Amino acid sequence: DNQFYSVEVGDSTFTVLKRYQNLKPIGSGAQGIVCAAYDAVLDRNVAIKKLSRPFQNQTHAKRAYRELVLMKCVNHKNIISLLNVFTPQKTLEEFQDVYLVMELMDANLCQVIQMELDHERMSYLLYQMLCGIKHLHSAGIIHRDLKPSNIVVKSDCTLKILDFGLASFMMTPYVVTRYYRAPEVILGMGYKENVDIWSVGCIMGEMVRHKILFPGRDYIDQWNKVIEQLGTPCPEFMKKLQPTVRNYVENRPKYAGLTFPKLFPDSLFPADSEHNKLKASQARDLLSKMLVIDPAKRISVDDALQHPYINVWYREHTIEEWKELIYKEVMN
Numbered sequence: 001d002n003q004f005y006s007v008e009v010g011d012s013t014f015t016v017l018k019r020y021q022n023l024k025p026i027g028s029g030a031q032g033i034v035c036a037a038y039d040a041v042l043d044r045n046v047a048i049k050k051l052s053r054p055f056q057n058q059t060h061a062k063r064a065y066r067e068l069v070l071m072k073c074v075n076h077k078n079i080i081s082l083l084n085v086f087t088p089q090k091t092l093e094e095f096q097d098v099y100l101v102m103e104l105m106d107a108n109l110c111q112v113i114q115m116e117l118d119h120e121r122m123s124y125l126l127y128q129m130l131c132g133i134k135h136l137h138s139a140g141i142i143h144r145d146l147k148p149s150n151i152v153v154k155s156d157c158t159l160k161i162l163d164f165g166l167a168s169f170m171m172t173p174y175v176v177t178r179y180y181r182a183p184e185v186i187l188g189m190g191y192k193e194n195v196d197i198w199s200v201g202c203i204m205g206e207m208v209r210h211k212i213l214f215p216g217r218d219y220i221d222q223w224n225k226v227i228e229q230l231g232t233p234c235p236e237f238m239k240k241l242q243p244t245v246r247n248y249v250e251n252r253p254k255y256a257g258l259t260f261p262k263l264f265p266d267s268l269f270p271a272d273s274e275h276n277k278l279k280a281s282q283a284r285d286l287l288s289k290m291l292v293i294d295p296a297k298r299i300s301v302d303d304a305l306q307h308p309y310i311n312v313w314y315r316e317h318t319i320e321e322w323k324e325l326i327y328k329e330v331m332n
Ligand SMILES: CNC(=O)CN1CCC(Nc2nccc(-c3cnc4ccccn34)n2)CC1
Pocket: 026, 027, 028, 029, 034, 047, 049, 102, 103, 104, 105, 106, 107, 108, 111, 152, 162
C-alpha cells in the first residue's frame, strides 16, 4: 500500500519512506529538523532533514532551492553528499514538505571544540576544511558563513561541510551566528575567495582557546572584539571602506595589536616533545596569517594548503512561484 508512514519525533510529524526506520532526533537547525535512521535498502545509517513549507518566504525559499540544487550537483569528499530527496505529497497542489536524506555524521565542530586535540587531528580536520572550501571556490561558490555548527565530522576524523553559504526579514524567533563572519562582510566592503579564510581562522583559534574568539551582541560589539585583540587595521584598509562606514571605524577608539604568541600562548598547545613544540609554532603561525583583518594581506586557500602545518596531508519570486520551482526540483 502506502509507500510511506508517519511517526511523531518531537512536535512535527516525520512522514518518510518505508526504507527509513527507527527515527531518532539528532538535531535541529534554522530551517529544518534532523533525524538519524536506518535505511533498510542500503543497510546503513543515514540522516534525514525535513523542510516544512520551504516556499513560505523568500528567505526559506531561496535557501532550500539553493541547497536542493547545489547539494545535488556539486560533489566532493569534504562536502556532505546527498543520498536521496523525497516528498510524501503526490501533486503540486498538495505539495508541502521536502525531506533531505544524507550520510550520517557523528558530530559538530562545536563538540570537537570542547576537547583538546593533537596536532595530527587538528591539522587534518583543518586540511579537509580547506579542501572543501577549495572545491567550493573552484565551483564559483564563496560560502561566507562557515561556522562550527555547519561543519560535521565522524569518529575517524573525517570532515564535511553542510550548507553552501549565503547567496531577508523573517518572523523567526531565533538569531543567526555572526561570530565567524569576515571583516568585509561585517562592514560590506565587497569580498573575494579568501573571505572564508577568516572563518576558518576563527574556528582554528577556538579549537585552541576553546572559546569564541570574537563574541558579541551585534556587529558593533563584534567589531570591537576584533580590534581589541588584533588591533585597529592599517590606514590603507579604511581607504577601501565606504565614506559612511569609514567614518564610524576611524572615529572608534584606536588600539594596539596584541601579538599572536600572546593571544595564543603555549599553555594551549602541546609541547611535551620537540615535535609538538615545533608543530605549536607552525600552528600559531598559520593563525596569524588567516586572522588578518585586511583581505589584501590575508593568506589565501591555496597558500594555507601549502603551509607546513597543513601540507603534511597534501531572483525575486513569489511564494507560489517558489513552491513550483522547489517541487519540480524535488521530482526531477
Ligand atoms: C554527537 N553529536 C551531537 O551532539 C550533534 N550531532 C550533529 C551531527 C549529527 N549528524 C548529522 N549528519 C548529517 C547531517 C546532519 C545535519 C544536517 N543539518 C543539520 C542541522 C542540525 C544538526 C545536524 N544536521 N547531522 C549527529 C548529532
